[PDB]
Curated annotation (Swiss-Prot), chains D, K:
It catalyses: a hydroperoxide + [thioredoxin]-dithiol = an alcohol + [thioredoxin]-disulfide + H2O. This is Thioredoxin-dependent peroxide reductase, mitochondrial. It is found in: Mitochondrion matrix; Cytoplasm; Early endosome. GO terms for biological process: cell redox homeostasis; cellular response to reactive oxygen species; hydrogen peroxide catabolic process; maternal placenta development; mitochondrion organization; myeloid cell differentiation; negative regulation of apoptotic process; positive regulation of cell population proliferation. The modification N6-succinyllysine is found at residues 22, 30. The active site is at 47 (cysteine sulfenic acid (-soh) intermediate). Keywords: Acetylation, Antioxidant, Cytoplasm, Disulfide bond, Endosome, Lipoprotein, Mitochondrion, Oxidoreductase, Palmitate, Peroxidase, Phosphoprotein, Redox-active center, Transit peptide. Homodimer; disulfide-linked, upon oxidation. 6 homodimers assemble to form a ring-like dodecamer. Interacts with NEK6. Interacts with LRRK2. Interacts with MAP3K13. Interacts with RPS6KC1 (via PX domain). GO terms for cellular component: cytosol; early endosome; mitochondrial matrix; mitochondrion; nucleoplasm; plasma membrane; protein-containing complex. The gene is PRDX3.
Length: 166, 167, 168, 168, 166, 169, 168, 167, 167, 164, 168, 168
């Protein structure tokens, strides 16, 4: 497993970034906070409100030296097609955050959020600091969505403690 | 998976006539089944193989044969790909089943999974009414294969089953 | 301690309404349970998370949810912290149970024990009436979490066990 | 053993090449494409149209830098005798392609096409690239013949891809 | 010797047709079982032909003759259908048994594993499936059919009259 | 830990004069150390052993002896217990160190940890200037112990080192 | 031999009221027992500890407590030492039992034997009426032991075992 | 003792032209050797085989071939059998060597010893000039063994070994 | 074997009165038995001892003692040697049994086999009516052994059995 | 330990002339040695053997032979027993060493330890100037050996190494 | 085992008793004391003083219920030849004690007196009681003669102690 | 284990009675000479000694052909001497012209394989040993029966004869 106070497991994969395919990795985020979250599958009948809320609020994360990356076991071609589906047809539309592909499933496995039975991720969220250390993790059962505002709050509070103690 | 052996059992969610249906190797008993594998939905390779099989499905249906295409994508990707129009790299209406191998086990069982990238080679299997493999072939990821040759194979196997080899 | 698995059994002495009561996971069979861990009694940190949970306890009860707080301190420490008034960094009265983990085994089974120092990370578990873990989260030692977001989640899990579709 | 994207298994054996005995190996094909195909037995009651069709079209393969060799578990003496039986009579007449003998059965075994029970090969075909990597394999039950034109089409199509990738 | 002939089964060419034969078809008779390397070689085929020419002589003393190679039964038939004047066998009075799997030659200790073909081995097997005589040659030397006949007669004589000298 | 054994090395956070300080066995070289374990802070049991040691602390100091009390409680527990006044059940001012054994390893190393409930027996150790255990004592119950007698023992060990064991006769 | 556990069983020959008697741990069932070891009879160390326990033997008797002294000497030596007058380094009259541990197994069982020299450390055990060890101490050296502190210890055990652990 | 392999090495005492002489396999380098085993000297079986070989010995010399008969008897039995006139079941004059295998080790090494009764089967071996076994045969019982046919084999090996397999 | 222990078992084919007979140690229950070994039939040593034993055979029978001569030769050599007239180095007719040790196991079990050359030392055993060894002697290959002394020893054993042995 | 073999090693504290002294087998090289064991100091059995050896000790010294008594008692008991009036069950003055075998290893190594009660049998050993055991004897009960006979044996061994 | 307080090891053998061969065992001596002693060899140039002295005194032993048996590694035939040699001629003459043969040397081995190098017994002596317990043992080197008077004193002393244990 | 014919005689060393006195003799003393080494059960038996006496009388006849005769039993050398000093008319040996070797340890009989382990005495075995220590002849009789000295002598001459001559 990953665990709070421990260096985050290394990851590398193909992501959709600003409608391009780009390889990314844990090392790209050196010196920045990272919010890494998992979701089960592209294109489902579940409302993409969590992914869309992170995309809508990305600028709030960017202004506190924090990046946001979404991950699922779908291919990077699925992610791009999801992105190019209009919001009114189940789609994501424009994304302000990277959608990373975990086609081999190793990333979800390394992050301890893979359901091996069905072969998809639980809804896991990780806040990783500028040194690759995991500060916060949470995991929800497949159906339930979580608060963007609360994640932002946490990221800020980690920063506050860095700079001013407890 | 070898010619003359029973085909490995498979079960999964497929897109069949725009709906999600559980299908399995046993659903095909008494029928010929062309099971073929492709790498991924929505790539920049035009889906001409899948589309050609779909356009010719009724030629298979008239010889007591079903056709099922398989990839490691989920059944949701499958449905979205069907619902994307052809002019946009989609499949549009499909006359064949699109089977999801999300767990990758079906591809593994058929000896077509590339483990590194986590996707399947382009492998094709003709399975007879008792579930025995009569023909397999496997192509490297880029090259498309021939629908009319597949149909000829299927009919050649039926001819032999009814008449024999001697000439 | 993974989501979708049954919570590990626990048993220990808690300070429940100013008495010592032996308490176990079996006591919550048929209810939701927020089980959270904190590092230490009597620190120089604002115990705001613990108080916030006691203040909003009625609201968790109103949705059939119990709240249990837990740390590696003795039950004697918990009592002494409760009897310290809030104006002096104490807890004052508490509407939630404070479970003592003196043997450190409950923090160990919930995967939140730091073995070096011998105290628990700030871990939180939402457990359903079948003892199944629906949600977990862990924060590093200093940062407090949000009670209202916890309640929101308990409600949202309940909504799903009745409709499962927060979307037309 | 043999799978697409892997280097083909090494082989060496005696072949009939232009009515003459020659020792040939996979190494003799470096720099060239190779269609290697197996058939069950010389002199059968099944019209050998597959072998004849390949020999007739050997020129077409030669023109796109591709050699063709047929293999069965028969001895090279059976191969030559069959080549010397006229087509009128169920023979092969002359042959524009190498006829390789797998008398020890080890070639068929290495290519995963030997049936151990009767000791003869299934109708397997392999397309092997100039670096000896397998690009295509197919296997048929003993009775059914494949299409030579479709095999040519495939060879040309793998060539097309090394030259131009694919983006439609 | 003083030992049972290993069991064998296979497809033979017998009077121009395919028959499945086994050691058990030869209970109550003498069997001469000989192996040769390959059909259609350039070695002179005069051993097989002599056995065919003299087959009736062996029948008259209740003895069958079976030639075996590792060729298929199709090869056997094709070799039988090639005129003698062309290096073929022509009409055959004895069974030509196919050892395609090579297991018969292996069981009889005559298989050269490396090239995968039989040496020129001959076995005289009695009515109870006991081996009375064996001989093996290194090379395309041919053996005398008359002398084989003599040995069969001599084994029969001994079993009827003992071996005491007159 | 038996007698003529060196005392097991220990290290930890202690409250010393109302302030947190890291201490260890090394700090006591060239001194006598009285090291004693008690089960828990804040119990209903009489705290008097700790108090008597604190009151008489100067008397141990005058014979080159230091006194350290230990339990499995955190150092925060210990301080809160110190800031709890005596009338109220606390310890008030402490003239001796209160060492925290949060990890439980010190109790375990000194053979006094009860692993079942995870707390220490009431053991006392007199350790000499070379870190050799001259005396050990263990009680299974909130029975007290004379601080006067512990001082007597410490003086006696010094007497015998200086004069030996021969009876005046 | 650990506080909370049952005292190891012992048996052997003691001097009691100038006489040889077999005594064992079972003889003290229902009573308190101070059992204490010393190294040797007739040394040049003052036997003030042994004499002091003897002098206030009846104060132990009055609280249902017996005192047994043990070393690895024979009972013949014990008797001789009892018969040496105190001005000469002897014991004179003894009101406590002097147990002989000639095989050394008693010291070995109580974890007080120094195998190398073959004599006991100065260990003292307070054993309750059920055979449970309530108190133990071991000294490196003849530093004496307060007899009055052992008595106070005995009475405090008796008080707690009746009343519990609370602050009167 | 298998065709195509080197003949096991042997050494022992033989009767040669009426005398005792140590012979070994190396004595035969550069010559063909016919080496044959028989059970016992002095039985009630007609010694037709040994006598026939002896009478045609010079025909084998003419093609550079030597003949050695062997049994598990001592050289003394050999000599005494030689001095027994032919009309009494003796061998009379011998033109071939009679080798003794008293320890039974030659017969073991050649794969012809029956251990239970402690005597050799009727094995015959043709060994070429380099000591390779070209031909072996073994008979149960005191059936014949043609000498003209043994000779013809020796001539045939010589031919092929110089000319090859083709006629 | 050793004086005092039961004689090892033996069984084999003997020449008895010019004919082949299967004999064994059991055939001699109730009789004394003189069992001696010699190296080989038909050697250049005078068969002085064998012949002397045969001349005195009835003297042994008179005292209920049999005599068996043994060697590693076959029973067929024994016969030939018996049917060779004494003046030609043969034995001429024999009044004692000549037992064949062809397998060499009898000499092995009696402790007189030389494994190197494969023949027996000159060993003699006197075996009582219950099969106990009462006397053994072993000699160098060239030696003279006396029948009269052997007969004396047999009688003396018979003496001791009847009358004890107190001076 | 059997006759004709080297005596096992021993080291211990003895009472020699009213003082404690460490003595060992090595101290006796070049000399004969009578080493004998007895059960316990201060028993009710009259100390008859030990007193006799002490009385005749000079007769042993005269022939180059020390005498050492040994039991499993401590050297402090030994002293106390020596400082007890002979008319009180005591030994009074002693002219021979009293060796303490508190660890019982000496009794063990000389094959006279009774492991059950933890004390030695009445064993006696004559050891020669090179450490070789020349004579040994062991009794069961309290029954007494003869000092005259032991003295005789010693003289007899000495005579032998000189005459035969 | 040959150690004091232990049952004496069993022996059987041929003895010379009153001029006749007789087999005797340890069992024959049940209910009686037995002095069992060993010497190296019959017919030595060392005069047989030890043996003769015991024989002279045999009846003083019988008075006290004690048999005496001498043993060495010689055969019973040497014993008898030695007894048949008059004392006036260097021999033993008439013997009033049993002379046991230990030809196999097993008796001497079992009594721990066999010197394995030369293969003869040391001069050992054993007093065995009526139930076969060894009460006394002693061993001298080969040359040195022991005392019959002393051996007799011992036997009486053992009996004395048995009849009335020795206090003072 | 025992020795057999064609083998070198096991070395022996021992004390023998030679010319009425003790001498140490070993196999080495007999190099360059023939040796008759014979075993008998025991001195002083009621079986009067034909075998031994007969060898002594014929002693010179063996000395004449370069051959020594040594008699051996498991008896001590003192028994040997005592037996020699017993006059023949009394069932003794009288003068001996042959060495009488003593095998007290029984090793020599054991090494020559003539030792009966049950009773610990030799069988009546005789060995003829050559100048080079090689056993030419062995012969063993059961305990009661005597061997002929003439035959033994005939044998020695026969062995010598064969060292000089062939076989007509």
């Amino acid at each position: 497993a990953p665990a709070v106070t421990q260096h985050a497991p290394y990851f590398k994969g193909t992501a959709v970034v600003s409608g391009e395919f780009k390889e990314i990795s844990l090392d790209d985020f050196k010196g920045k906070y990272l919010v890494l979250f998992f979701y089960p599958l592209d294109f489902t009948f579940v409302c993409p409100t969590e992914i869309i809320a992170f995309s809508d609020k990305a600028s709030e994360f960017h202004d506190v030296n924090c990046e946001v990356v979404a991950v699922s076991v779908d291919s990077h071609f699925s992610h791009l097609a999801w992105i190019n589906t209009p919001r009114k047809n189940g789609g994501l539309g424009h994304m302000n955050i990277a959608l990373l592909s975990d086609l081999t499933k190793q990333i979800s496995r390394d992050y301890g959020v893979l359901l091996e039975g069905p072969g998809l991720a639980l809804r896991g969220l990780f806040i990783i600091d500028p040194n690759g250390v995991i500060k916060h993790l949470s995991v929800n059962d497949l159906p339930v969505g979580r608060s963007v505002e609360e994640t932002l709050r946490l990221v800020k509070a980690f920063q506050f403690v860095e700079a001013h103690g407890e």
